[PDB]
């Protein structure tokens, strides 16, 4: 019935979602890097 | 009450973090279809 | 000296950083959409 | 102690959220230099 029981669960859930979404951002970094490589290679292959 | 103000901050931080994730998911798909959109042009240059 | 004084500040800071970074992600969406448009227009101009 | 465990969760959520922002900032710059990297090719097609 006490308050923290739902707060602690929320803070624990908040940090776990931040962790899996910080990983998601990491995969985005590599996604955009691969795109960068592809756009740069199209330009160099047009030079 | 600080323990009603807490529970608001946290519940709203959880909401805003689901907003952020929805943007990250949109980013992932926008990058993927941009990657595939380049494939034809890239192939044309061999 | 009490605990919550630093917790409440941290939770308030946590939510404010999430807000400004959720905006940052919004501008990223538009960044990548503009890039999408440019890559698609290069392909159509090559078709 | 729950109020020492709290203060850990929050302080570590703040740390992980600065990690996330550092990735978003890297994304912003990677997208910008990709946008400018396309300019020459795009100009070549008028």
Numbering used by the authors:
A (entry chain A), C (entry chain A): 2 to 48
B (entry chain B), D (entry chain B): 163 to 208
Paper lines:
To further dissect at atomic level the SIKE1-SLMAP assembly, we determined the crystal structure of SIKE1 CC1 (residues 5–65) in complex with SLMAP CC1 (residues 167–226) at 2.3 Å resolution. An SIKE1 CC1 homodimer was interlaced with an SLMAP CC1 homodimer to assemble as a parallel four-helical bundle. A group of hydrophobic residues including I5, I8, A12, L15, L19, A26, L29, L36, V40, and M43 from SIKE1 CC1, and L168, L172, A175, L182, L186, L189, and L193 from SLMAP CC1 packed together to form a hydrophobic core. Moreover, residues D11, D23, Q32, and R39 from SIKE1 CC1 contacted residues Q173, R178, K185, Q190, S200, and D201 from SLMAP CC1 through hydrogen bonds and salt bridges. As shown in the bio-layer interferometry and MBP pulldown results, except for SIKE1-M43E, all other mutations on the complex interface including SIKE1 (L15D, L19D, L36D) and SLMAP (L182D, L186D, L189D, L193D) abolished the interactions between SIKE1 and SLMAP. Taken together, these results revealed a 2:2 heterotetrameric assembly of SIKE1-SLMAP and identified the leucine residues on the complex interface, namely L15, L19, and L36 of SIKE1 and L182, L186, L189, and L193 of SLMAP essential for SIKE1-SLMAP assembly. A further mapping experiment identified residues 5–65 of SIKE1 and residues 167–226 of SLMAP as the minimal regions mediating the interactions between the two proteins with a Kd of 6.9 μM. Meanwhile, SIKE1 CC1 can form a 2:2 hetrotetramer with SLMAP CC1. More importantly, SLMAP associated with STRN3 only in the presence of SIKE1. Together, these results indicated that SLMAP is recruited to STRN3 via SIKE1.
Our results supported a “two-arm” architecture of the STRIPAK complex, with the PP2Aa/c-bound STRNs acting as an organizing center to hold Hippo or other MST kinases with STRIP1 as one arm and SIKE1-SLMAP as the other. Moreover, we determined the crystal structures of the second coiled-coil domain of SIKE1 alone, and in complex with an STRN3 peptide, as well as the structure of the first coiled-coil domain of SIKE1 in complex with the first coiled-coil domain of SLMAP. SIKE1 functions to bridge SLMAP through CC1 on one hand and STRN3 through CC2 on the other. In particular, we discovered SIKE1 as a key adaptor that recruits MST-bound SLMAP to PP2A-bound STRN, forming a molecular arm MST-SLMAP-SIKE1-STRN-PP2Aa/c.
